[PDB]
Amino acid sequence: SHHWGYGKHNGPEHWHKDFPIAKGERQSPVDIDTHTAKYDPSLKPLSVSYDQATSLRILNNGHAFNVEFDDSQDKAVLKGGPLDGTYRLIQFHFHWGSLDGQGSEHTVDKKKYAAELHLVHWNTKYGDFGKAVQQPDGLAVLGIFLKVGSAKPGLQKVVDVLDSIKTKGKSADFTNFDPRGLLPESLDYWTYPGSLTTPPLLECVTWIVLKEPISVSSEQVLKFRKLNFNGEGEPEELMVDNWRPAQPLKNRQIKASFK
Ligand SMILES: [Zn+2]
Secondary structure, three states, X not given: OOOOOOOOOOOHHHHXXXXXXXXXXXXXXXXXXXXXXXXXXXXXXXXXXXXXXXXXXXXXXXOOEEEEEOOOOOOOEEEEEOOOOOEEEEEEEEXXXXXXXXXXXXXXXXXXXXXXXXXXXXXXXXXXXHHHOOOOOOEEEEEEEEEEOOOXXXXXXXXXXXXXXXXXXXXXXXXXXXXXXXXXXXXXXXXXXXXXXXXXXXXXXXXXXXXXXXXXXXXXXXHXXXXXXXXOOOOOOEOOOOOOOOOOOOOOOOEEOOO
């Protein structure tokens, strides 16, 4: 079959066997070379409208945990920046490390952060998520780096329920979560065309990666690292290092929103 993971034999280096697009022209993540990434003055202001965001549930899918949202109307939408039209938030999740010095998928001048938050939106041009993922302009993912320092109050509600979804397949109701509480103070960003960073690795993503990291506490990070890849009863495999390394940039240019 096409089971995949982050281990020695089922991890990113081997994904291509089952998902040949893994060696495609627009794979993610990438290293962001700040020297070559040029200001684009044509990028419009980035707009997030999250006041009416409706979170539904949190689940451990054996690779990460996802917080899922009602995307049936324009209640949590990303617009502007590089984007044409309206993108609805469907879910967010994180990637993180076993150690603070690794965990991010994107890197900045080769620097790795402790983790990376992905807020996943899809383009209402296409009428549902399934249709959007099949298109180069189908998704917009807002990438937010985490470093370890001061606790992040707006993360605490997430961290506080991770004990209920320790293992693969677990889910719980998760309402009234405000994703605005996960944002940094500056929304300066880089953007480039790329892919899902997990199988099926489709090249449907406009990446928007914020320059300014959020700070989270070592306590919050420790809670992430206590999660399991495995299901209940199976041998323990700590959910850590669920990040894909930098892929070749190939022909692509990375644009900066800031002068
Ligand atoms: Zn992700």
